[PDB]
Amino acid sequence: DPNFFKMVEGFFDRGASIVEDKLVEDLKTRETEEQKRNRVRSILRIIKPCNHVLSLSFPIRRDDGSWEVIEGYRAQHSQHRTPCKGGIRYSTDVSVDEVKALASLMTYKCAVVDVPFGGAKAGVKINPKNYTDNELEKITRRFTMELAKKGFIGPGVDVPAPDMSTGEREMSWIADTYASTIGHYDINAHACVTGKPISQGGIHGRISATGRGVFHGIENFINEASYMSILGMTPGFGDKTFVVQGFGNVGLHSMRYLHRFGAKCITVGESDGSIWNPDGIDPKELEDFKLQHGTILGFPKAKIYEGSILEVDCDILIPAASEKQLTKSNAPRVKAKIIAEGANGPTTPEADKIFLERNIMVIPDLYLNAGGVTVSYFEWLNNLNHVSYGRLTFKYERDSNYHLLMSVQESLERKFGKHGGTIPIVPTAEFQDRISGASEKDIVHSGLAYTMERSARQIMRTAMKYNLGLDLRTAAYVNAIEKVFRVYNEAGVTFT
Amino acid sequence: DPNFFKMVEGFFDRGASIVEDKLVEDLKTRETEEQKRNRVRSILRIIKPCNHVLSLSFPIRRDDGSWEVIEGYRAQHSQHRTPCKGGIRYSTDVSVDEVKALASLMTYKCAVVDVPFGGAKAGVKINPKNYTDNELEKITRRFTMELAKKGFIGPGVDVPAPDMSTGEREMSWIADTYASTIGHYDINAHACVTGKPISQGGIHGRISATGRGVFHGIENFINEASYMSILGMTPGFGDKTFVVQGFGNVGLHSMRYLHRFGAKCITVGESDGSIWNPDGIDPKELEDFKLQHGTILGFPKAKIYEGSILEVDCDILIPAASEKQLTKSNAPRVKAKIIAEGANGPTTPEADKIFLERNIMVIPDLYLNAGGVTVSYFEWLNNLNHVSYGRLTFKYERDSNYHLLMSVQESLERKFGKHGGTIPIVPTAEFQDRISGASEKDIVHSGLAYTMERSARQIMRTAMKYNLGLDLRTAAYVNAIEKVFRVYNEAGVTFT
Amino acid sequence: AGVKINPKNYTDNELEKITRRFTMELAKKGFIGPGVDVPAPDMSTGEREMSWIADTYASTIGHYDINAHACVTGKPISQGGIHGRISATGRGVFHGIENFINEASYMSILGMTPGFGDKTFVVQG
Amino acid sequence: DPNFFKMVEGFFDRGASIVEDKLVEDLKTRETEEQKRNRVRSILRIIKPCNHVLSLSFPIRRDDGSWEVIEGYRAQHSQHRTPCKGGIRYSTDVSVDEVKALASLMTYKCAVVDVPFGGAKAGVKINPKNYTDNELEKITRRFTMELAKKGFIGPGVDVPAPDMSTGEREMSWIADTYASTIGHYDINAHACVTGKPISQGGIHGRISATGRGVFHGIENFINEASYMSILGMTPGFGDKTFVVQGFGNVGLHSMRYLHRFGAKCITVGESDGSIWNPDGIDPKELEDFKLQHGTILGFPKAKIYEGSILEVDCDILIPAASEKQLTKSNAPRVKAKIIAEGANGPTTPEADKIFLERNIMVIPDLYLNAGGVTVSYFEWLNNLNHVSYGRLTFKYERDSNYHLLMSVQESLERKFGKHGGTIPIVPTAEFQDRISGASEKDIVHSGLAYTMERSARQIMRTAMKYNLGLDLRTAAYVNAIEKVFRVYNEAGVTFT
């Protein structure tokens, strides 16, 4: 509907209009009260826009011998903290304005969850379905060169990741290209990209984790009646029904990772049609037809559903397909109590207005889609430390804990001894799984759940400081802006 | 009026529609006749667009302590031949589309006059008049960094030059910035930029030469009745009156360098008003008020002229102010026989239609504004060879020619001798000026006049090969396209 | 390092135009870098001057270096600093004293008894 | 006897002939069954050969003023995973084919024990004994330059280590040379080489550990009657006699590190003669004459033994001198039950045939000489993390464990208290040594023993999956090949 870039920009102001006041008070100086206001406002006029944008065109030769051109983009929003990150989106609806927007979000999202990165986002006007695997690989390996050739790819400057219509392959084709032209002498060449296969430097839960970040976000608000008492809902996933808008990696892995804890799906909607079954749907069964058919229309254990998922009665609505999915023309027909934006700005500033009036909890992209980022932060480290986590200590930490329990056992016996004879001090079931120390699978699962809780705590803490009620979205930007700001300010806005 | 970028693009097609046929015949291969046509058309779909475009934003602190942001652009059209060049334009009417357009021209212009460069063009949304000399220098030195910081400035990749609202200062501020951050270890750091002051590696006639390129272009068609017989005009500058649209470096130095050979100016028009005097105008006198007043309104020896210069009766119309100056709304009122585009596409595709119907000779930007390029090609060399031209031979070449004349004298005497006694063989007046060899002032003056004639010869030669008559513009693109094409073709369109 | 200068006589817009120029010339000659040489604060400096050195190296040379913010220490917290950056020097002093006062092996010579609750001290500057 | 390079190559096939079948099944795709077979076979035709080989020659000036030339080699086998490693061998029997072979092994060995490195190996036609310490240092420091000068030395590309006829000195001369020409600006310059002295970035147990890797390998099969029931032997080192073929760092430190646990040596053989004493031999006493005499012939507490060590009756035969030591001409006279190849392919494909027929357990170089690699993996890390392991936590981890025991003590007292008064919970003896956390000496000792066990577990696990019985050698390659393969496959075999 509107300029997707200005939409995001319209939000950002809402947050800044608010923090401005307190933000001036924090600022310590001898300036006039108004001059301080002109310091902060000036900085905020620097943060909002993107600093670097690159638009380029490719000659490529097809399989049939004919050439065509390709249009590709790559934006960097903020250099307050490097590297910069973002994904590569293959799509025909790519545009400079969508890229600049999404770049801005990655900058604020990363500040919500305290990961030391800036924001970027790429794009390619292309539809992969129309091209082979020998043409998509001849594009990607050429896209990578031109950027590296101009300083937009690198372990320490900019780091791409997966996004719509990409996967691990495309990341395996970027790595070999950088590492085999420039990275050869760089000891950190495989850190140029995340989302890689396991055999190329990846991480367990690379993709499942996004879905889990969603979950651990929901689980971190459902556990508080402080807000569900407003909604008129009771905590518990065994009591909830949800629907999904599209099957990305978010839609599936968010779906099944819910299904494990009693959350019932009732329908799902792809780009080609919805399908509904009030008795439930089995995501395991769903992957089955996707390998045998490609689409969900034709699934035997569900009824083809006529109408938009957005018009389905449910308890939680998961938009995961694409931004702009929910507008003011249909917001009044939410038919659902919570909305969880797993889709990079599906809603609108108006919808937000509707959903405050209707008392609808909307979970923002921020803090909700920040799972796939932290993980990619753990894959960037893994490849800078050149070692599996904990490998060095698995055997040492294992028995160090076994010599500890013997020091309890033997000191206790020492006093009572014969009183009860010998007192075996042995692990439990789960500690026996965790006695050798942390494995990557465990660091990941935990670090994620930790960050998410830590952050929501900071979010809900300011929403009450300012009494934003359900307007969580604004509650987030305030934290982001408040952090980013400190960096430019303390930094001496420029080095000129 | 229209998309300045598409305008240029609409032209480019006109030329390609024509050369296509012959271009296929030149192409040697075993493909089918149609397949060859799909080879050339595919390439032509690669040439037309720009390959790299960069949009960036700057935080800068003013003198009053307040920050503002600045929007800057830099396009590279073609890498068929490096370095890439183009100027830096300071103006508030800067836009991505103007930059991409002008970049394309520099690519074709440089191929008309056979200089081994590609095309670029920069821009900055700014009005210098509103800023100090301590703010313009704090912008420029920051603009330079960000680009170099991303691989768009360098002796061997990209080389900026002056353009509207800039000069030698700004080039003195770019050099010291590159040479003092990156160029330190590069032996060719001062070749990163042209248009420099003399004391920093410049060239005599740096700026006057553009005006002269104009002249030597006109002089290379006025000398042929083959075309002025159509116009109904007689050769000779002592017989011509001309007007000028704006006083850049083109408007002045083109004006006075004409005045030397009997070409009479009757008016001139700045951004603030025209001024007309049918008895003539003295450009020497004109620089006088410009140092004492700034504008031409108020000049005592000319009458303030009410109306657009474009509505003045004359023999030659020199648009030099800015593109788009002459459109279809006023083209029918040309009131002039020749037009000489010293202004980067002042006219339109429609105007061209009008001016063919009216039998009006239009001299294209191409081949006409290519003076300031060749010179900048001689300044890039001067600074790669690290020596004044000819210095090594001035004394050797001087007497070598003096020992030659003695070998004539002494051999002649040897036979006749007493017949006439001694036979002094001595230089003339001008050879005595040219006996020591070429000085930079002489290489420049000559190399320029040479190229220009060589090129017009190739231009008029194809215009007759295809019978384009007065449509010189299309006659140029055909040569350009025909050259550029050979490069992509023979090169193996890509290295992927 | 060193600079013949008295900061008190200069503004904050002149001290920052010095520092950012000092940094260049050295880096320009191989005396600043994460792996070659690393400056820190000393008399008459602080965290500001370290915030002006970082942005200058990172914005000319460090751009491609993944370790650009390691070129300097004493930075502000928001630029890669550490808790107790400055308080710790004082504490190092303390933990040094505390590590000899705890031994009569030497205070028996001095004729003093262990214990800070029993001591008076003075400070020079 | 045969082409040492083809020998290794003949093995590699044996393993690939086997895994091929299962390897195709793992491969998931839509290709034809035969096409998949042509995918795997093609890859296996890529793995087997070495990718880079460098042969170079040096002019060096001796002490007597006379020059001579030197021939040096450096091979890199696989770039599937960088850095590449291998040692520098000074010897007159160096050849391109020996280097390519050994390089291949290092590639497979490193995959057995899961260290992220490839394979390399160097060489120099030289006999150190004939040259001074001022000539060997003038060679080494020149060898290093030429390679670095061509991209074969570096923390992130290639990393040399010690081997036959070298030591820590030569590594101290390589470091100062790289760090003082190229490494100056590299923060990781001391990671260019391993095997360094302690004061230059080395590790405790640098060299002793190889011997221990041997031990921990033997100890990991002797502990299982599953295989010694075949051999007809009983577990226990206090019950075993062994002999050693040469005194490298392996022969000594493997010998004494056995002697600690009741393993009796009966003879040993150097390049100049054997020596036997059935009552035992004292390795401490053995270092004594080596400092006072150089050779073992003349040792008072042992009888000079006439004949090859390989002809000695024993229980375990440790070849440590040099490859090819045991052939088919003498294999039938093994006179020993287990053989443990600490010597980079002492045996042959035929001997293997003999030793399967004779039911002789042969422990392969792979998994047995992989001690000196893991350690060098811990020295490469130490020097990338720029810190002693654990330093940061010794004091924190120490009392954190002391505040833990008080939380047991105080909670127990809290309930029982007076029942038994105070209940001192204090460490044991050894935990008091391990309460402050891990020191490098402890990480090393443990990490080594861990890896070795983990790996043998994987080895014996597949030998039973395929029923290879005693043919452990083939059981190893299958794992290696199975790992390496996944990397090329998932990687998109090439980036072209």
Ligand SMILES: NC(=O)C1=CN([C@@H]2O[C@H](COP(=O)(O)OP(=O)(O)OC[C@H]3O[C@@H](n4cnc5c(N)ncnc54)[C@H](O)[C@@H]3O)[C@@H](O)[C@H]2O)C=CC1
């Ligand atoms: N191409 C490269 O340089 C890559 C290196 N790595 C390294 O591996 C670590 C993370 O992954 P891993 O620890 O490997 O995964 P991991 O922690 O699950 O265990 C190692 C795995 O990598 C494979 N592997 C190990 N050594 C190998 C070798 N020499 N050849 C072929 N495959 C081998 C094994 O199949 C094993 O499953 C990082 O510390 C990084 O240094 C990881 C990915 C790519």
Ligand SMILES: NC(=O)C1=CN([C@@H]2O[C@H](COP(=O)(O)OP(=O)(O)OC[C@H]3O[C@@H](n4cnc5c(N)ncnc54)[C@H](O)[C@@H]3O)[C@@H](O)[C@H]2O)C=CC1
């Ligand atoms: N996949 C990821 O790693 C991440 C995804 N996201 C967000 O999650 C959303 C979905 O996940 P992705 O894997 O990125 O996408 P995806 O690559 O899984 O594709 C989305 C799926 O939804 C369907 N779809 C597309 N347009 C639709 C429409 N208008 N209505 C209904 N269904 C439609 C398509 O069939 C497609 O298979 C995206 O929009 C993206 O913004 C955000 C961060 C990371």
Ligand SMILES: NC(=O)C1=CN([C@@H]2O[C@H](COP(=O)(O)OP(=O)(O)OC[C@H]3O[C@@H](n4cnc5c(N)ncnc54)[C@H](O)[C@@H]3O)[C@@H](O)[C@H]2O)C=CC1
């Ligand atoms: N900063 C730099 O490195 C520059 C070097 N040059 C060099 O000069 C040549 C072109 O210009 P020139 O030949 O110099 O102009 P030129 O050919 O007119 O004669 C040399 C001029 O440069 C000045 N000059 C010569 N040596 C000088 C010195 N040691 N210190 C100060 N000024 C000096 C003199 O005033 C003289 O007028 C090029 O070959 C280039 O190598 C030119 C410009 C800048």
Ligand SMILES: NC(=O)C1=CN([C@@H]2O[C@H](COP(=O)(O)OP(=O)(O)OC[C@H]3O[C@@H](n4cnc5c(N)ncnc54)[C@H](O)[C@@H]3O)[C@@H](O)[C@H]2O)C=CC1
């Ligand atoms: N100056 C150069 O080195 C080159 C200039 N050109 C072309 O020549 C033209 C003029 O020369 P430059 O020195 O670039 O410009 P300039 O920087 O000399 O400025 C043009 C002058 O014309 C006047 N003017 C501006 N807009 C006008 C309008 N709409 N109507 C009438 N007068 C106006 C202004 O007062 C200004 O002083 C430019 O448009 C440019 O496209 C092309 C190549 C090189």
Ligand SMILES: NC(=O)C1=CN([C@@H]2O[C@H](COP(=O)(O)OP(=O)(O)OC[C@H]3O[C@@H](n4cnc5c(N)ncnc54)[C@H](O)[C@@H]3O)[C@@H](O)[C@H]2O)C=CC1
């Ligand atoms: N030349 C270099 O840059 C080297 C640096 N190292 C550093 O040391 C660590 C590993 O070895 P260490 O921890 O040193 O061994 P370590 O862990 O046993 O303890 C430090 C030892 O290094 C020596 N040492 C420490 N600081 C020193 C200084 N300023 N001058 C002279 N000698 C000093 C001491 O004798 C001490 O025994 C690595 O983290 C690495 O960063 C190690 C070897 C060479």
Ligand SMILES: NC(=O)C1=CN([C@@H]2O[C@H](COP(=O)(O)OP(=O)(O)OC[C@H]3O[C@@H](n4cnc5c(N)ncnc54)[C@H](O)[C@@H]3O)[C@@H](O)[C@H]2O)C=CC1
């Ligand atoms: N030393 C090391 O770090 C490593 C050694 N190895 C293997 O271990 C073996 C021995 O250890 P290194 O220290 O490398 O060798 P080394 O440098 O200790 O020398 C081997 C010793 O064995 C003796 N010897 C040489 N040729 C002999 C022959 N034909 N018969 C009997 N004795 C002979 C020599 O006197 C020499 O002192 C080598 O062959 C090598 O392949 C493998 C990996 C690492």
